[PDB]
From Swiss-Prot, chain A:
Belongs to the universal ribosomal protein uL30 family. InterPro entries: Ribo_uL30_ferredoxin-like_sf (IPR036919), Ribosomal_uL30 (IPR039699), Ribosomal_uL30_CS (IPR018038), Ribosomal_uL30_euk (IPR005998), Ribosomal_uL30_euk_arc (IPR035808), Ribosomal_uL30_ferredoxin-like (IPR016082), Ribosomal_uL30_N_euk (IPR012988). Pfam families: Ribosomal_L30, Ribosomal_L30_N. There are 3 genes for uL30 in S.pombe. Keywords: Cytoplasm, Nucleus, Ribonucleoprotein, Ribosomal protein. CDD domains: Ribosomal_L7_archeal_euk. Component of the ribosome, a large ribonucleoprotein complex responsible for the synthesis of proteins in the cell. The small ribosomal subunit (SSU) binds messenger RNAs (mRNAs) and translates the encoded message by selecting cognate aminoacyl-transfer RNA (tRNA) molecules. The large subunit (LSU) contains the ribosomal catalytic site termed the peptidyl transferase center (PTC), which catalyzes the formation of peptide bonds, thereby polymerizing the amino acids delivered by tRNAs into a polypeptide chain. GO terms for cellular component: cytoplasm; cytosolic large ribosomal subunit; nucleolus; preribosome. This is Large ribosomal subunit protein uL30B. Component of the large ribosomal subunit (LSU). Mature yeast ribosomes consist of a small (40S) and a large (60S) subunit. The 40S small subunit contains 1 molecule of ribosomal RNA (18S rRNA) and at least 33 different proteins. The large 60S subunit contains 3 rRNA molecules (25S, 5.8S and 5S rRNA) and at least 46 different proteins. GO terms for molecular function: RNA binding; structural constituent of ribosome. It is found in: Cytoplasm; Nucleus, Nucleolus.
UniProtKB/Swiss-Prot annotation, chain B:
Residues 1-51 are annotated as: C-terminal-extended nuclear localization signal. This is Large ribosomal subunit protein uL4B. It comes from the Eukaryota. Component of the ribosome, a large ribonucleoprotein complex responsible for the synthesis of proteins in the cell. The small ribosomal subunit (SSU) binds messenger RNAs (mRNAs) and translates the encoded message by selecting cognate aminoacyl-transfer RNA (tRNA) molecules. The large subunit (LSU) contains the ribosomal catalytic site termed the peptidyl transferase center (PTC), which catalyzes the formation of peptide bonds, thereby polymerizing the amino acids delivered by tRNAs into a polypeptide chain. The gene is rpl401. The lineage of its organism: Eukaryota, Fungi, Dikarya, Ascomycota, Taphrinomycotina. Belongs to the universal ribosomal protein uL4 family. It comes from Schizosaccharomyces pombe (strain 972 / ATCC 24843) (Fission yeast). It is found in: Cytoplasm. There are 2 genes for uL4 in S.pombe. The eukaryote-specific C-terminal extension harbors a nuclear import signal and delivers the ACL4-uL4/RPL4 complex to the pre-ribosome, triggering uL4 release from ACL4 and incorporation into the 60S ribosomal subunit. Component of the large ribosomal subunit (LSU). Mature yeast ribosomes consist of a small (40S) and a large (60S) subunit. The 40S small subunit contains 1 molecule of ribosomal RNA (18S rRNA) and at least 33 different proteins. The large 60S subunit contains 3 rRNA molecules (25S, 5.8S and 5S rRNA) and at least 46 different proteins. uL4 is associated with the polypeptide exit tunnel. uL4 interacts with its chaperone ACL4 and the nuclear import receptor KAP104.
From Swiss-Prot, chain C:
GO terms for biological process: cytoplasmic translation. InterPro entries: Ribosomal_eL32 (IPR001515), Ribosomal_eL32_CS (IPR018263), Ribosomal_eL32_sf (IPR036351). The modification Phosphoserine is found at residue 74. Keywords: Cytoplasm, Nucleus, Phosphoprotein, Ribonucleoprotein, Ribosomal protein. This is Large ribosomal subunit protein eL32A. Component of the ribosome, a large ribonucleoprotein complex responsible for the synthesis of proteins in the cell. The small ribosomal subunit (SSU) binds messenger RNAs (mRNAs) and translates the encoded message by selecting cognate aminoacyl-transfer RNA (tRNA) molecules. The large subunit (LSU) contains the ribosomal catalytic site termed the peptidyl transferase center (PTC), which catalyzes the formation of peptide bonds, thereby polymerizing the amino acids delivered by tRNAs into a polypeptide chain. Its main location: cytoplasm. One of its GO terms (molecular function) is structural constituent of ribosome. SMART domains: Ribosomal_L32e (SM01393). One of its GO terms (cellular component) is cytosol. It comes from Schizosaccharomyces pombe (strain 972 / ATCC 24843) (Fission yeast). There are 2 genes for eL32 in S.pombe. It is found in: Cytoplasm; Nucleus. Component of the large ribosomal subunit (LSU). Mature yeast ribosomes consist of a small (40S) and a large (60S) subunit. The 40S small subunit contains 1 molecule of ribosomal RNA (18S rRNA) and at least 33 different proteins. The large 60S subunit contains 3 rRNA molecules (25S, 5.8S and 5S rRNA) and at least 46 different proteins.
Length: 214, 51, 119
RNA sequence: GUACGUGAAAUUGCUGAAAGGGAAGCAUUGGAAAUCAGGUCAGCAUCAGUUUUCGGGGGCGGAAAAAGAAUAAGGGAAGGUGGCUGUUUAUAGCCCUUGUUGUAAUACGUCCACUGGGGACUGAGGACUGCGGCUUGCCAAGGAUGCUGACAUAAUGGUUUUCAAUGGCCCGUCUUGAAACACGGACCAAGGAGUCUAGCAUCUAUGCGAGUGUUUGGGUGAUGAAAACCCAUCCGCGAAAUGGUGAAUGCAGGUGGGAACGCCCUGGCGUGCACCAUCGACCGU
RNA sequence: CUGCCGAAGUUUCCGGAUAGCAGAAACUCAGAUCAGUUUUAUGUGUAAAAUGAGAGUUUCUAGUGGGCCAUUUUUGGUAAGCAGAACUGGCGAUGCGGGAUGAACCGAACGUGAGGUUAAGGUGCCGGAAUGUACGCUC
RNA sequence: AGAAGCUCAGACGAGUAGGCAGGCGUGGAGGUUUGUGACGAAGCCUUGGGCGUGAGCCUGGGUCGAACAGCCUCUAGU
């Protein structure tokens, strides 16, 4: 009776401390990058920000008239439907995947708000091969307690910062089922994003697209 | 259990359930209240206003 | 809870309107080029399991009870414990004498009669 | 009423209702008229879920916006002003650099677990459990309740006919990659096409099990006796194979994997069916 | 009558056996293997990280063995057409939005509905949607 | 607690050849319903009502005048 209430109360405070620690980390990382860029500019030096280990990929072309070589990759990316968004560990083994499914998907660097809103609204966990909504921290705790992930904030951190267990967290998240964008795509959507279309890599504009889709 | 899905962003009560930290967040902080140091190298300005 | 039906029109057999020899009772078209089996535009709709109605309200009349066929006063007694679930429907071949006896017994038992004012 | 039980459809005449400017039938949504059936239908508030549309406030970022204004230096000139075509701020001013007012503003990007409104769709579930919040209690916290009205001679829901908007190419067969063709189709009613049996094989069920199978036949059966019931002797398949002979050497043989169980302090040990690789035999076992 | 599963569309050997695709039955396998995929390494082939998915076999039993269209490479070309391969696609088993109309064009793949938002294509009127905005060309 | 049942959760839904399952209807047979019926069985008709996704089922009214059905099994000139 009292033991479970005390343990859960202490667990609640522990999550609060972790979330406070994570929030400070994001603020410090953003502030320190700004300070580094400011000092480089003052000295005349050029500062290169680090590569983004995280990418968010949205499938923009349907299941019709797609070559088998490209189809298998979206099967491996769990992009089995149009307007489906997933997190991918951006590395040298993924850059080549996304370069050959350039005409069929779009991707970019998601900021903290994009990841935070996606898991809050579209966050569904794969529990016993079922799509269970992440409606409470105990759902995540029983499914990711081995990797010391206890709450939604812990899951957001493990996804945003690409921690050691990013593969387990990304595989736990059922692919986000995003709606059609509010306001629509561009006039011609299947042209490359650079050439005025809406396909391929788009860097920090994946956020502006995702907010439409949420 | 969980007959209906409630969006934490639109539900202040569900947000409290999921994230026991939103009760103390302090979103806006005033940090540009000291002498704003205009930080721009003169060589950088020449390169910027080049050609 | 109210009763809502996914469909109200009946499903007619194709071209039953055109031909008197072709009855309106539904028959699944086996034609290979049947545009109606292909679900073209403007064509009529086919029976699908998606048209099935709510399990909790299936077989229920507008009033919210299920019609139960009754032949004699013995049958009505079987509806004593389900007067809020089943409504007695006297059979069409029950004579006028047994009609009034069935109606009176059901009315005393509190069991609804669907076609009481008949014969 | 012998043109005689019941009297269907095709088809035809009459009457009523309606429609019709070179097809029609059909489908969807409603109106109108007709006709049925059984609480019906509205308004607002506070919420929940989905969503759309306007604002307000505040962080942070960039050349710590660029500008700009005001105000001090110097520089230059014009698309040359006052002055006198030519010149250098005068009786207009402009451009460039610097200082200053400066932690200037604003635009913009971005963020707020900041906030104020307007509209629409939805109300699934049915004692209590849960996760939380505010404080036993209360709550926007595991799905709608509250306050009212109007109407019952009508509102809603239908059903029939018709009109309007939108859509809708004739069905079957055949050929081909595919159509189209090519046949079939005046209309309606009734009839009308994978059946019975012998053998074989698979699977399943049932009875018995090293057996199994009564119904060639006999017994018997008073109530239907072509049924049911009982079974003497054979016989069929199986129990032995190999090409006359004719099988545990070895717990009807050891090793490994293995179903299942047991003992332990996940794993270990023991036992180890079926089946499968293995060394082995006996005349296939 | 409704529901579920669901191909082949052709190799390889002599009308067929075969394999392939689809199912069933019975087994073992989760400290395991797979993959119409990408990296890394060794010299296009070979070998070992990423990502996804539980992955295997044995028996046996249905249906299939055509073509059409298009891309790319290439072989010749030829008055000019085209002809010969390979290649994976699209159709074939499949409705829907648009292209005024359509087997092959652009989107999209289907239980019955409510609401929201889009794709392709569009916003003078037929026709739902700006006789919008800005800059040019044209009689 | 018709465990054949009850309940919770998630995903999926075109579909020819083929494969598999559950249902509707008809004639006759065994059992059963203290079954229906000249106070009207069956049939038929109807701009009457209800149920089912569907095959179909029940019912109001009219007509009619002697037989008929539900359930469990059997059977087929279904």
């Amino acid at each position: 009776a009292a033991e479970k209430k005390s343990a859960r109360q202490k667990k609640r405070e522990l999550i609060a401390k972790r979330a406070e620690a994570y929030e400070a980390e994001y603020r410090a990382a953003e502030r320190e990058q700004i300070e580094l860029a400011r000092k480089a500019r003052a000295e005349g030096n050029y500062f290169v920000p680090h590569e983004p280990k995280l990418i968010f990929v949205v499938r923009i072309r349907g299941i019709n008239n797609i070559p088998p070589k490209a189809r298998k990759i979206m099967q491996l990316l769990r992009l089995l439907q149009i307007n489906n968004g997933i997190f991918v560990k951006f590395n040298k083994a993924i850059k080549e995947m996304l370069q050959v499914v350039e005409p069929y998907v779009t991707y970019g660097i998601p900021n903290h708000k994009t990841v935070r809103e996606l898991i809050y609204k579209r966050g569904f966990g794969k529990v016993n091969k079922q799509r269970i909504p992440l409606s409470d921290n105990a759902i995540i705790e029983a499914a990711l307690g081995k990797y010391s992930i206890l709450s939604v904030e812990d899951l957001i951190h493990e996804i945003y910062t690409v921690g050691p267990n990013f593969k387990q967290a990304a595989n736990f998240l059922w692919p986000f089922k995003l709606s059609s964008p509010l306001g629509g795509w561009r006039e011609r959507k299947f042209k490359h994003f650079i050439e005025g279309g809406d396909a391929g890599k788009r860097d920090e504009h994946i956020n502006g697209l995702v907010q439409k889709m949420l | 259990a969980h007959v209906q899905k409630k969006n934490p962003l639109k539900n202040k009560a569900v947000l409290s359930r999921l994230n026991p930290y939103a009760k103390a967040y302090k979103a806006n902080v005033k940090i540009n209240s000291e002498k704003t140091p205009k930080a721009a190298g003169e060589k950088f300005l020449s390169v910027l206003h080049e050609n | 809870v109210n009763i809502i039906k996914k469909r109200t029109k009946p499903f007619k057999r194709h071209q039953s309107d055109r031909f008197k020899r072709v009855g309106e009772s539904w028959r699944k078209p086996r034609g290979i080029d049947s545009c109606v089996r292909r679900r073209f535009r403007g064509t009529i709709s086919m029976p699908k399991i998606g048209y099935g109605n709510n399990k909790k309200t299936r077989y229920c009349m507008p009033n919210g009870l299920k019609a139960f066929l009754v032949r004699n006063v013995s049958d009505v007694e079987l509806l004593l414990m389900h007067n809020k679930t089943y409504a007695a429907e006297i059979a069409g071949n029950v004579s006028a004498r047994k009609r009034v006896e069935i109606v009176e017994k059901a009315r005393a038992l509190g069991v609804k009669v669907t076609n009481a004012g008949a014969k």
